[PDB]
């Protein structure tokens, strides 16, 4: 297709441009003498070709140091731009395997073209590269979708042709194999050696033998068994369908839809009866569900002391509970306190903090024998009357503003908010903040703040070992409340009782749902409630999880954050429910709201089928303990009685069809579709802290073993022969083979016919060759051994898990290396030691990834070797949506178009949702071994077989406290199993290890099950196609099938066109069966479909959590919002903001508008300032006053983003917005522009800090007991003696030890082995560093940052932090009017791609790294030396200088300095930006402009140019200069002089002229030393010039402001070119300059190399009265000049103009077509037909002008347009071998078929005669719905005569030579 159009697509501003490389892939259905080059010139043929013979050496860009080597295409457009492109092909199927080609191509051409573009005049040069592969195409030749595939059709064909003529494949690639040889050889050596232990391996493990592999790979599938099994299963599926739904008797939907309603009522009543009987029948219970008193007191002044003249009473009324408070008040009144002084680093490992951080916790004594007797004892039916919970959910004081808006509790944060928002000071922000304070006084965060205070306080009291005589008492602060704590012997629970004076309680939040309260003598005591520790990390972040419900839900209702309405009735219910659920943290309370999803998705069920929600019942049995759960269950048990009677309805409006009346699950309200789907995620949160405790840990032991005893005795069904029937734990062999033999075909038809010979040489190249130790991981592991099994042996020891540096070091000392001499021991170490050894972890959230297994760091090695061996096989398969990361958003969204290319307009859609019941405990390790050793080519067998022969007797280690507590029918079983019989044989008599053979593990053996599921889905597709091809007695229905599936998740999409009346109904039925049969035919494999699937949705697809409704995408937003509070235990105090911003930037992709991801930031503010300190450590005042003056993110200072575009770009963007303009602008400069230690420089993450908050952490255990292998105490000095070991990999053991020692001690590698309730462990880690810096000084050491600093330090800044940073200085204040519109949007993406430290490695070093040319490669230092003044070529002096101490410390400062904000993807309103916001719920010039953009290039003599525009400006009269068009309006042929005195032109007089000298060659000679001044874009620069020999040069530059100098340099790059000054010679440094310049470059200062640009704010502010009468207009090589002569023979261009190529209009041609008045457009030439662009007869009339030369005005070379004969000779094709020997692609793409890879044909027949046809009642086949989710004609008539008159050269070799002249 064109070269022309492709070249015409791109654009550029100046000099040289590379653009941005893009990556296209396969989306549509991919169709389809002697030489060795066919692979290249078969593709890119016909066009990639320039029909000009050479064009040639790079000549057109002038002169030669190079040669100018020969490119492929060198195009030149009609606007002067030059385009050079090169094409090359690669055979590597891996993405990123093209990066190599894209890097080695630009290397060839970057040097000479950069050299030539610097030695010519204004230049437009474009360099681009094109690379193609069998899998994709990477280019920034910015192509479209259709031809991207066309480039691969020919590529595959060319490779097929190429492979055959190939010989000794002698090409070896010299650029590769430098290290890849030394790598690959090692893996070859190893795998060629002896890894198996095969004689005793068959005995150590039950079923692992080399008799299944050989009898599996060499036996073809039995087609008879298959053709009988399918025929037996289809009839069963059909009979089951006709009876689970009622179809046999003649009925209609009406009386059909009721029978299932009646039976669902029956089933629900049955369940209710079964529950009621098995409980203590008790009608009116009485208790509280919220276990905290409903006190809301007006806060007061902050203090931490138990106030005094209160205490006394009446306390003495009871003598039980008031007596206790009286006794403690009287104890604390006088003396009786004690010195228990929690310190902040007794708490942790550490120095010597000061007095103000040690606080009191005041013992108490105890009470007499009245109440000890009572303190010692304290120290369900489904028919309950629970409607009190409803009364609470329908009436609340919750969302009702209190009167506490201005109190001391928010005044602390209402000032940090001011300081943060002090940057984006707009009217919008001042309205988006007073709408967040309105949510900080809403009567619920007020009640939650003191609850969070209490929870924080109680978290610290999990220790301190209070005496036998015991009590504690604190007044949490900001409000008078008093607690009494009593720790326990343990860490599991805490006792407390709240007391409060009866006068400060102003308001109670209401209802009868809160716990009762003792009514004492004017006090409220709360009688010793108890709270566990697993329920503590929640109550802490309670305010931050209510503000995200008062804001989110308030937004999903059509409310505006800048309005104040009454709380709607539909709002109170949604808030009072997420309030209740968040406090009853019991697991089975949320397991009921979650299952409102799988029971409501079933309402989308299509025709013939029925919504069956009552199948979700066998999971709701429960014990039914608590009270709220009762209401939840009895409400949820009506959403499956309301749906089963009336499904959701379809309504096609010609619009992309929406659905009927949906409704809320719990409270039934017919709220909208996108609104209900979030209600399924009300109770959801995430967490990572280990939750070792009795109850929950029990269920996770049952889950692992529940399918253990199921394993069959006989192994004849596991690996062996067919079964025809599964036994709940085994599968058939022949089906596995016939399924894994389909993916191997679907791979080879896209990628290969050769591919193993690349997959191997890739894996091999990667597996053991680039895995160099000393970089394995910090992944915590386990140390479990045989000496730990007997419970009687060590009943009292502990368990630390040895984060995984021990196996690292103990090997590193042993002369180890590549991880390839390491499988070396550790396999023997496992074989002769028994089996795998595994411990467990419970990350409690409620559910999800809730249990992870550690690996023991000794089977981890042999597992990492098989991880990649399968991750690389997954990367090739096309359905894999877990190896291939992003394509999951490119198969559902592309089914779409892909349906329509195939068949007209359309659709119909039929979609499933699949899943698996038990994906972990259902598989058996023979399947994965067979799949792997089936794909891995030749020698991967003896290794993978052994490495998979390890999960056969696997031993798991249960908690120690568990067994201690041992000495529900399941714990009773485990007890008997441990002490004495019935025997389980799972743990044998009396030991500690769950031992099991059945089932893979959760996360360990990953990327291997995905292969299995891929083969299964491929077989399913290849069978569905084959059945669609035979629908009814030979009649073939047509349709496409798409299968997308990750691990334990699947989906199946189908579409079919209806061309009639039964035929839709006659066809839809035939689909249902075919799609419903996947309940069967999976048990033949090891896959069991659960009851969480939904079959036959008609227009939606439910895959992972994103749902695809017909044309509108919807994603749970509430899933990620409540995931924005996770607690941070890092210790880089500045990494907390990094993590907060990272977690925030996901709510954007979650569909949250911009007005919400700023309130989320406002909440994260609280969540962040609550952890440093806000409720304890009464020095926050000082800690606030410090940051209120300093503020920087390096200390605890939070940075809020821009309200519009909130959370769009990451933290780095905010660091750029704030450091640049008015945040600091000094703390960073001082680090960069002073020599000889503000603060020792150290970088954390992306930012950089004072290296004081990067200190706390226990490095001791790794180096006091692990410095036992050399590593002398001279370690830092000995490294500093040579710093070369920091950048190269390794040479010996010693330097490897040094590298390990440097790795252990910097960031973030902590080893002490925390047991603590992490919540105080973060407040400590905050306040410690925040205090040890307060005791100022360093703060007494002028600023901005220069433009050259931002570029090196923040690289993306001009790329995309200026576009967005200038479009937000857009309406920042406006207020749009609310409209209504529904529309599909685009897919937008900002910073996608496919460094600044490698520069150092080489001046110092050698080592062949960053491949620059010695122009740029030897010019990068200059730019790198200019910046970070004190930096030099010395490896040592880098040191004797600033802000490092040491070279070792700086590997981290050059390491991340930099840094490069992430990726964000987001929607829109269509295509163009500030067109993405959006969201947040005059032609006369054009005709004239065209008549100039075409005019400058016409055949014309230069003087005839101004003959036409001068006269042209008499009729096109554009308006005022009140808004490049500005210059155009500047052409009135007022006064003009002052019109340039404004608006970004350039002018300036010559203040100090030089001396003129008459040189004897017709030219005057300027010789004196003069000065030029000017005013360009508001700088008022001075230009000092001098020269005494051959020419003049540039002495000095001055300028008044540094805001813009990258543009000013351009205005001076040409201003010397005008007047003729050279910039090569050096100067003598005069003052303190910013930087200096070489011919046109930027530099250091410290070198005194060239002309220094010494900025002086006051340098020169004068101008000198230029005379306006000397003003001309000029023309040249196409350029406009409204210039002025300043000196005799020296002119100065004021304005210029270069016409773009995107302005060649066609509407102006009509206007210009003959209003014959334009005399310049007469009868003299194709003028008036070139301009008015259409081809008396001028063809023959030009063959005369080229031989007889008499063209009074067309006096050019005579060949400027006549070379364009190829434009029309291009649309006529010239490719010989591409059309005649190219049998038209005959559409060989049949998708798949069952008769291929099954050697024999198939016959699959069922019975469909007389059931019924009239069941469906609707019509959509006739329905509307749609599309499920230049200017080259110059000379065209007079060319076809050449086609009439008639490789071309050969032909020539007469009557047409006159035309051949025009082409040559
Ligand atoms: Mg699913």
């Amino acid at each position: 297709m064109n070269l022309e159009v492709l070249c015409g697509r791109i654009n550029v501003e100046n000099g040289l441009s590379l653009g941005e490389p893009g990556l296209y892939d396969q989306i549509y259905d991919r169709p389809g003498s002697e030489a060795y080059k066919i692979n290249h010139d078969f593709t890119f043929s016909g066009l990639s070709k320039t029909t000009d013979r050479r064009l040639s050496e790079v000549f057109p860009i002038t002169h030669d140091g190079s040669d100018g080597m020969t490119p492929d295409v060198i195009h030149t457009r009609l606007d002067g731009t030059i385009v050079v492109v090169e094409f090359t092909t690669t055979r590597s199927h891996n993405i990123g395997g093209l990066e190599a080609a894209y890097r080695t191509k630009i290397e060839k051409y970057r040097d000479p073209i950069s050299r030539r573009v610097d030695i010519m005049e204004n230049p437009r040069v474009f360099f681009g590269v094109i690379v193609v592969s069998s899998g994709g195409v990477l280019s920034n030749m910015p192509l479209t979708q259709d031809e991207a595939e066309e480039l691969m059709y020919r590529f595959c064909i060319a490779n097929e042709i190429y492979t055959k003529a190939r010989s000794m494949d002698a090409d070896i690639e010299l650029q590769k194999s430098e290290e890849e040889l030394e790598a690959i050889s090692r893996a070859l050596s190893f795998f060629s050696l002896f890894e198996p232990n095969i004689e005793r391996v068959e005995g150590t493990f039950p079923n692992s033998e080399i008799e299944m592999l050989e009898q599996f790979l060499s036996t073809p599938a039995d087609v008879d068994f298959i053709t009988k099994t399918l025929k037996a299963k289809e009839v069963e599926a059909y009979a089951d369908l006709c009876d689970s739904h009622y179809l046999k008797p003649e009925k209609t939907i009406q009386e059909r839809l009721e029978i299932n309603r009646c039976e669902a009522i029956d089933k629900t009543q049955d369940l209710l009866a079964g529950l009621h009987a098995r409980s203590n029948k008790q009608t009116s219970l009485n208790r509280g569900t919220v276990k905290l008193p409903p006190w809301l007191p007006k806060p007061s002044s902050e203090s931490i002391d138990i106030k005094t003249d209160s205490g006394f009473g009446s306390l003495m009324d009871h003598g039980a509970y008031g007596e206790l408070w009286a006794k403690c008040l009287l104890d604390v009144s006088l003396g009786n306190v004690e010195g228990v002084v929690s310190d902040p680093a007794k708490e942790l490992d550490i120095d010597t903090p000061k007095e103000a951080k040690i606080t009191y916790r005041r013992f108490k004594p105890a009470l007499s024998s009245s109440a000890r007797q009572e303190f010692s004892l304290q120290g369900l039916s489904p028919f309950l009357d629970v409607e009190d919970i409803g009364d609470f959910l329908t009436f609340n004081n919750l969302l009702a503003d209190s009167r506490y808006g201005d109190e001391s509790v928010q005044r602390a944060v209402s000032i940090l908010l001011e300081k943060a928002s002090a940057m984006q000071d707009t009217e919008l922000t001042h309205a988006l903040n007073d709408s967040f304070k309105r949510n900080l006084s809403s009567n619920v965060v007020q009640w939650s703040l003191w609850v969070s205070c209490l929870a924080q306080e109680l978290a610290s009291a999990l220790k301190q070992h209070c005496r036998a005589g015991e009590f504690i008492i604190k007044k949490l602060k900001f409000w008078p409340i008093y607690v009494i704590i009593k720790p326990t012997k343990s860490s599991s629970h805490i006792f407390y009782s709240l007391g409060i004076r009866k006068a400060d309680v102003t308001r109670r939040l209401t209802g009868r749902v809160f716990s009762e309260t003792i009514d004492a003598g004017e006090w409220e005591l709360t009688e010793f409630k108890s709270l566990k520790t697993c329920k503590l990390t929640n109550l802490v972040n309670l305010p931050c999880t209510m503000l995200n419900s008062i804001a989110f839900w308030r937004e999903k209702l059509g409310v505006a954050p800048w309005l104040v309405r009454k709380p709607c009735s539909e709002l109170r219910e949604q808030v009072g429910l997420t309030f209740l659920i968040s406090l009853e943290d019991k697991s089975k309370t949320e397991e009921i709201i979650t299952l409102t999803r799988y029971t409501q998705m079933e309402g989308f069920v299509s025709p013939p089928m029925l919504p069956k929600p009552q199948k979700m019942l066998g999971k709701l049995d429960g014990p039914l303990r608590t009270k709220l759960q009762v209401y939840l269950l009895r409400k949820h048990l009506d959403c499956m009685v309301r749906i089963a009677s009336q499904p959701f309805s379809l309504i096609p409006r010609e619009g992309r069809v929406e659905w009927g009346g949906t409704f809320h699950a719990i409270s039934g309200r017919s709220t909208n579709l996108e609104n209900m789907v979030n209600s399924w995620y009300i109770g959801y949160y995430k967490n990572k802290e280990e939750s070792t405790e009795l109850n929950a840990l029990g269920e996770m032991y049952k889950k692992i073993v529940e399918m253990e005893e199921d394993k069959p005795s006989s192994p004849e069904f596991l690996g062996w022969g067919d079964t025809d029937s599964p036994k709940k734990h085994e599968f058939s062999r022949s089906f596995l083979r016939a399924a894994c033999s389909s993916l191997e075909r679907e791979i080879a038809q896209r990628h290969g016919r050769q591919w193993k010979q690349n997959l191997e040489e890739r894996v091999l190249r990667e597996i053991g060759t680039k895995n160099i130790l000393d970089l394995a991981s910090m992944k915590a592991t386990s140390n479990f051994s045989k000496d730990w099994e007997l419970y009687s042996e060590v009943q009292t020891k502990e368990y630390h898990r040895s984060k995984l540096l021990e196996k690292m070091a103990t090997l590193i000392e042993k002369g180890v290396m590549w991880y390839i001499d390491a499988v070396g021991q550790a396999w023997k170490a496992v074989l002769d030691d028994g089996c795998m050894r595994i411990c467990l972890f419970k990350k409690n959230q409620h559910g999800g990834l809730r249990e992870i297994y550690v690996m023991d760091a000794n089977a981890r090695l042999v597992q990492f070797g098989v991880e990649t061996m399968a991750r690389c096989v997954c990367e090739l398969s096309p359905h894999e949506t877990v190896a291939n990361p992003r394509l999951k958003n490119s198969i559902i969204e592309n089914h779409g178009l892909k349906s329509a290319r195939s068949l007209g307009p359309g659709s119909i859609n039929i979609n499933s949702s699949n899943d698996a019941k038990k994906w972990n405990q259902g598989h058996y390790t023979t399947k994965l071994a067979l799949v792997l050793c089936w794909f891995m080519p030749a020698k991967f067998h003896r290794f993978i077989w052994a490495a998979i022969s390890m999960f056969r007797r696997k031993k798991m280690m249960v908690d120690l406290r568990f067994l201690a507590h041992l000495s529900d029918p399941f714990r009773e079983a485990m007890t008997d199993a441990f002490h004495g019989n019935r025997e389980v044989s799972w743990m044998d008599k009396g030991r500690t290890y769950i031992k099991t053979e059945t089932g893979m593990m959760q996360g360990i053996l990953h990327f291997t099950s995905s292969l299995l599921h891929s083969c299964v889905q491929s077989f399913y597709k290849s069978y569905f196609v084959s059945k669609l091809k035979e629908g009814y007695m030979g009649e073939s229905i047509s349709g496409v099938v798409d299968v997308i599936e990750g691990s334990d998740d699947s989906a199946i999409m189908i579409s079919i066109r209806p061309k009639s009346d039964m035929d839709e109904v006659r066809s839809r039925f035939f689909v249902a069966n075919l799609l419903h049969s996947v309940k069967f035919l999976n048990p033949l494999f090891g896959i069991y479909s659960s009851e969480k699937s939904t079959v036959n949705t008609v227009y939606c697809v439910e895959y992972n959590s994103e749902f695809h409704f017909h044309r509108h995408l919807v994603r749970p937003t509430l899933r990620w919002i409540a995931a924005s509070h996770q607690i941070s235990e890092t210790e880089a105090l500045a990494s907390r903001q990094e993590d907060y911003s990272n977690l925030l930037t996901q709510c954007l992709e979650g569909g949250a508008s911009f007005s919400l991801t700023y309130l989320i930031q406002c909440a994260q503010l609280l969540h962040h300032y609550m952890l440093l300190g806000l409720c304890l450590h009464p020095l926050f005042g000082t800690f606030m006053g410090m940051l209120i003056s300093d503020p920087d993110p390096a200390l605890g200072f939070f940075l809020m983003d821009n309200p519009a575009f909130a959370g769009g770009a990451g933290f780095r963007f905010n660091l750029w917005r704030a450091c640049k303009t008015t945040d600091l602008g000094r703390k960073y400069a001082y680090y960069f522009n002073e020599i000889e230690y503000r603060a020792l420089d150290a970088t954390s993450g992306g930012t950089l800090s004072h290296s004081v908050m990067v200190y706390w952490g226990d490095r001791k255990k790794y180096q006091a007991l692990l410095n036992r292998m050399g590593l002398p105490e001279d370690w830092v000095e000995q490294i500093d003696e040579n710093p070369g070991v920091l950048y190269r990999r390794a040479a010996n053991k010693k330097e490897l030890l040094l590298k390990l020692a440097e790795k252990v001690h910097s960031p973030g590698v902590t080893s002490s082995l925390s047991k603590g309730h992490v919540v105080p462990r973060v407040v400590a880690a905050g306040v410690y560093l925040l205090s040890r810096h307060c005791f100022f000084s360093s703060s007494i050491h002028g600023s901005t940052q220069k433009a050259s600093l931002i570029k090196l330090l923040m690289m993306s800044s001009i790329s995309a932090m200026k576009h967005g940073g200038s479009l937000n200085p857009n309406q920042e204040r406006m207020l749009f009017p609310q409209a209504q519109e529904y529309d599909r949007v685009c897919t937008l993406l900002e910073e996608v791609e496919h460094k600044a430290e490698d520069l150092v490695s080489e001046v110092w070093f050698g080592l062949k790294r960053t491949k620059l040319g010695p122009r740029l490669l030897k010019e990068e230092w200059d730019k790198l030396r200019a910046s970070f003044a004190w930096l030099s070529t010395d490896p040592s002096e880098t040191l004797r200088d600033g802000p490092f101490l040491s070279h070792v410390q700086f590997r981290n400062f050059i390491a991340h300095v930099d840094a490069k904000s992430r990726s964000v993807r987001l929607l829109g309103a269509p295509v163009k930006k500030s067109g993405g916001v959006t969201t947040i719920s005059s032609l006369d010039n054009q005709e004239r402009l065209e008549s100039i953009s075409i005019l400058k290039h016409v055949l014309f003599m230069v003087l005839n140019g101004p003959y036409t525009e001068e006269y042209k400006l008499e009729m096109i009269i554009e308006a005022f200069s009140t808004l490049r068009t500005m210059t155009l309006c500047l052409l009135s042929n007022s006064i003009l002089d002052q019109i340039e005195r404004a608006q970004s032109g350039t002018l300036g007089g010559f203040s100090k002229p030089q001396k003129t000298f008459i040189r004897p060659g017709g030219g005057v000679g300027y010789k004196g030393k003069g000065v030029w001044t000017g005013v360009m874009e508001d700088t008022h620069v001075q230009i000092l010039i001098d020269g005494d020999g051959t020419s003049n040069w540039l002495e000095e530059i001055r300028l008044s402001s540094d805001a813009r100098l990258y543009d000013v340099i351009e205005s001076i790059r040409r201003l010397c070119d005008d007047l003729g000054i050279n910039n090569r010679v050096a100067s003598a440094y005069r003052g303190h300059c910013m930087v200096r310049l070489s011919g046109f470059k930027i530099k250091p200062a410290s070198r005194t190399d060239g002309c220094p640009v010494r900025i002086m704010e006051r340098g020169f502010r004068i101008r000198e009265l230029q005379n306006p009468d000397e003003v001309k207009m000029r023309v040249r090589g196409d350029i406009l000049n409204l210039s002025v002569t300043i000196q005799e023979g020296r002119v100065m261009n004021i304005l210029s103009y270069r016409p773009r190529d995107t302005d060649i209009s066609e509407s102006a041609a009509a206007y210009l077509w003959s209003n014959r008045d334009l005399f310049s457009f007469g009868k003299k030439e194709p003028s008036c037909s070139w301009i008015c662009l259409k081809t008396a007869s001028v063809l023959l009339a030009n063959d005369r002008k080229t031989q007889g030369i008499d063209n009074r005005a067309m006096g050019n070379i005579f060949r400027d347009c006549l070379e364009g004969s190829l434009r029309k000779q291009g649309l006529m094709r010239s490719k010989l071998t591409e059309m005649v020997e190219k049998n038209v692609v005959p559409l060989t793409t049949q998708e798949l078929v069952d008769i291929l890879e099954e050697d024999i044909d198939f016959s699959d027949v069922i019975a469909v005669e007389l059931s019924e046809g009239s069941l469906d009642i609707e019509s959509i086949f006739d329905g509307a719905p749609i599309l499920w989710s230049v200017s080259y004609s110059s000379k065209y008539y007079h060319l076809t005569l050449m086609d009439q008159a008639a490789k071309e050269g050969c032909r020539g070799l007469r009557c047409m030579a006159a035309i051949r002249e025009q082409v040559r």
Side-chain angles (χ1 to χ4, degrees), residues 597 913-915 1049-1050 1102-1104:
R597 165 162 163 272
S913 286
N914 298 339
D915 65 78
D1049 218 2
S1050 305
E1102 256 143 296
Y1103 185 5
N1104 58 33

Side-chain angles (χ1 to χ4, degrees), residues 287-472:
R287 76 170 67 248
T289 80
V290 172
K291 316 216 164 182
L292 303 163
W295 302 322
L296 206 127
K298 157 191 165 191
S300 66
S301 158
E302 62 88 19
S303 179
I304 180 167
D305 189 351
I306 289 91
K307 191 259 283 177
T308 333
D309 151 1
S310 70
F312 281 147
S314 64
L315 298 160
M316 251 119 19
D317 43 29
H318 198 20
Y321 267 83
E323 135 143 272
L324 198 199
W325 291 95
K327 227 103 160 248
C328 183
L329 191 232
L330 265 171
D331 289 345
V332 158
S333 178
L334 311 174
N336 192 31
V337 291
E338 292 177 350
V340 176
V341 296
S342 114
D343 289 345
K346 289 179 179 179
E347 257 26 38
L348 4 156
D349 285 14
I350 303 301
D351 54 355
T352 46
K354 313 317 161 53
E355 328 308 335
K357 43 66 74 314
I358 311 279
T359 18
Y360 51 15
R361 282 153 197 265
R362 283 177 179 178
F363 308 179
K364 290 283 99 175
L367 270 73
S368 81
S369 211
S370 84
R372 302 173 51 256
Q373 208 341 250
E374 191 267 359
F375 294 137
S376 44
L377 65 92
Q378 279 171 355
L380 188 46
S381 87
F383 291 112
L384 266 179
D385 206 58
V386 78
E387 58 89 20
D388 198 289
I389 284 178
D391 309 335
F392 167 72
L393 291 201
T394 70
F395 295 91
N396 306 127
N397 197 3
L398 287 190
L399 289 203
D401 180 27
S402 87
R403 297 294 88 194
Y404 307 151
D406 48 356
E407 302 294 339
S408 43
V409 61
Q410 53 257 358
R411 284 161 192 166
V413 65
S414 178
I415 284 188
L416 294 150
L417 263 178
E418 183 48 76
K419 194 67 189 67
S421 68
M423 182 191 303
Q424 38 266 33
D425 172 22
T426 79
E427 187 218 4
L428 201 63
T429 301
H430 298 348
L432 270 296
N433 276 1
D434 291 331
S435 168
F436 164 81
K437 295 183 182 48
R438 253 191 285 119
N439 283 350
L440 213 61
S441 87
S442 85
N443 212 327
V444 180
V445 279
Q446 294 300 320
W447 181 80
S448 159
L449 274 187
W450 71 260
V451 176
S452 159
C453 195
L454 172 145
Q456 282 173 72
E457 278 276 17
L458 302 198
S460 43
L462 265 295
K463 300 210 67 49
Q464 302 149 349
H465 176 210
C466 179
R467 300 295 181 278
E470 79 291 30
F471 273 156
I472 319 289

